[PDB]
């Protein structure tokens, strides 16, 4: 920890502080994540065990790079590559200038590459949200915060229900599905996609029930034609109001026909029919993809 000089505190989570730091010997700017160990009570936090072990298996240009783990008797510090800011902060700062479409498309192409890599190596992220996605000065974006990720199995089994941040939470989970897999992460990126475009949250529910109502008000209330098995889901209610699906021309007006088509496949009710990160990369929307540097 001697090679490192703290520059500023850039964050705080449940098990310790986040720092911008600089390697005094190499000049490398990093993020230090400090994790307190419960030396007399619970030991190393189960969230840090998954996060470290999963992130060490995940070496891809669109996933935050874990550079080192520095042990002491009383702390862990995870050394991460430094990334300028999160997507939430960038969208917010872009209130008056907007975000260029080619930047939105490039970012989405990258998130999907990061995501296909995870799923390829049997990792669900389970907390995709703008706050958890990191951009640099040069036009790259990366999946970060692997605190809620887990290694899956084929076929999946019952995993933790209380998982995803509500606005990003897939309808199969909200209806208390026994099983969720890769499709839950595609949902969240669908929500992120529309939010990059409108720059407001697609479905900002107040609670689980309200979360569903908001989804149904936009996408149409699901039935058995569109989603075999909905009506037999544990938290399904035959009394749900029957809303007609709105035009995506109205849900995401700036979006072209290609983008609308992609958003629509990412936000398919039936998790089985919702597109894979792998398949989404082949969508015509990405035919003209470039890599703009953002104004920062």
């Amino acid at each position: 920890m001697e090679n490192f000089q703290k520059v500023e505190k850039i964050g705080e989570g449940t098990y310790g502080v986040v720092y911008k730091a600089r390697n005094k010997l190499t000049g490398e700017v990093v993020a230090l994540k400090k994790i307190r160990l419960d030396t007399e009570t619970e030991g190393v936090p189960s969230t840090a065990i998954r996060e470290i072990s999963l992130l060490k298996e995940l070496n891809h240009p669109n996933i935050v790079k874990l550079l080192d783990v520095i042990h002491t008797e009383n702390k862990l510090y995870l050394v991460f590559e430094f990334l300028h800011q999160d997507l939430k902060k960038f969208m917010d700062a872009s209130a008056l200038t907007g975000i260029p479409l080619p930047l939105i498309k490039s970012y989405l192409f990258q998130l999907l590459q990061g995501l296909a890599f995870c799923h390829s190596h049997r990792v669900l992220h389970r907390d995709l949200k703008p706050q958890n996605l990191l951009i640099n000065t040069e036009g790259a974006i990366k999946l970060a915060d692997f605190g809620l990720a887990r290694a899956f199995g084929v076929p999946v089994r019952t995993y933790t229900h209380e998982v995803v941040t509500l606005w990003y939470r897939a309808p199969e989970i909200l209806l208390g599905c026994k099983y969720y897999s890769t499709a839950v992460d595609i949902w969240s990126l669908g929500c992120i996609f529309a939010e990059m475009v409108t720059r407001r949250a697609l479905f900002p529910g107040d609670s689980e029930i309200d979360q569903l109502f908001r989804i149904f008000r936009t996408l149409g209330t699901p039935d058995e034609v569109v989603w075999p098995g909905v009506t037999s889901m544990p938290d399904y209610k035959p009394s749900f109001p029957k809303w007609a699906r709105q035009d995506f021309s109205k849900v995401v007006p700036p979006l072209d026909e290609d983008g609308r088509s992609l958003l629509s496949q990412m936000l398919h009710y039936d998790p089985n029919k919702r597109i894979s990160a792998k398949a989404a990369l082949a969508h015509p929307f990405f035919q003209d993809v470039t890599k703009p540097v953002p104004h920062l």
Binding site: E42, I49, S120
Partner: protein
């Protein structure tokens, strides 16, 4: 089948990377295959008492074997290693892991909590945090998707036999989880239905009945001698109706290979 082929290929690669040293017991001046057998059988019992996943058990044995590939352990510490490993497998795999005090309680106060917490950290450091190991159970789960139709007895019997493999370092340390899984499935299928390692799995794994034969030879023997093994917790576990009483079934006298 979303990423089914990508995942399988990647697991095949990763099992070689998390492979314990085949010859490590002979290099442990103070511990034996028989002591290791006692340890795992006890962990099987911890696994039943705390209603833990089967994958947690499998993960813990991988962790133990890798640790014991790297460090000399005295026999009075063998159990401290096994407990910390079960604890780390729990944190990794379980939705609701037992708390650390329960891990101390199961060793019936052989060690303190501090001991168990310091061992946990020593174990992480020795494994350099590489915890996401492929298991026999991971490969079996994938193989089960190549049934038509799924047969519950075949599945429970395949699990039972994959789990017996955990107990005996001789000879199972020389096979890869995917190989033990292939032996377990074929033998389980052949025992319930009379069928053989499906062509879909040969195309998947590139394992034929002949390449599976050495393991299958060993595993069949283990299946035959199971009622007379010193360690018995897995048999007792697999008589429960939860596993369709499959340890009460009779092994074939021949395989015909």
């Amino acid at each position: 089948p979303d990423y089914h082929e990508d995942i399988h290929t990647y697991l095949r690669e990763m099992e070689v990377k998390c492979k314990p040293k085949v010859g490590y017991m002979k290099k442990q001046p103070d511990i034996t295959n028989s002591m290791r057998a006692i340890l795992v059988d006890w962990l099987v019992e911890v696994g039943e008492e705390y209603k833990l996943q089967n994958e947690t058990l499998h993960l813990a044995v991988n962790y133990i074997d890798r640790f014991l590939s790297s460090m000399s352990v005295l026999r009075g510490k063998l159990q401290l290693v096994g407990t910390a490993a079960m604890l780390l497998a729990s944190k990794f795999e379980e939705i609701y892991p037992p708390e650390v005090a329960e891990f101390v309680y199961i060793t019936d106060d052989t060690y303190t909590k501090k001991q168990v917490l310091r061992m946990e950290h020593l174990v992480l450091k020795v494994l350099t945090f590489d915890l996401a190991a492929p298991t026999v159970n991971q490969f079996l789960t994938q193989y089960f998707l190549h049934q038509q139709p799924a047969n519950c007895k075949v599945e429970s019997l395949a699990m039972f036999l994959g789990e017996l493999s955990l107990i005996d370092a001789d000879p199972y340390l020389k096979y890869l989880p995917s190989v033990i899984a292939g032996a377990a499935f074929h033998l389980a299928l052949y025992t319930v239905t009379g069928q053989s390692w499906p062509e879909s799995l040969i195309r998947k794994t590139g394992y034929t009945l002949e390449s599976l034969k050495p393991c299958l030879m060993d595993l069949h023997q283990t299946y035959l001698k199971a009622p007379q093994h010193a360690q018995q917790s897995i048999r007792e576990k697999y008589k429960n109706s939860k596993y369709h009483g499959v340890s009460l079934l009779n092994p074939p006298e021949t395989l015909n290979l």
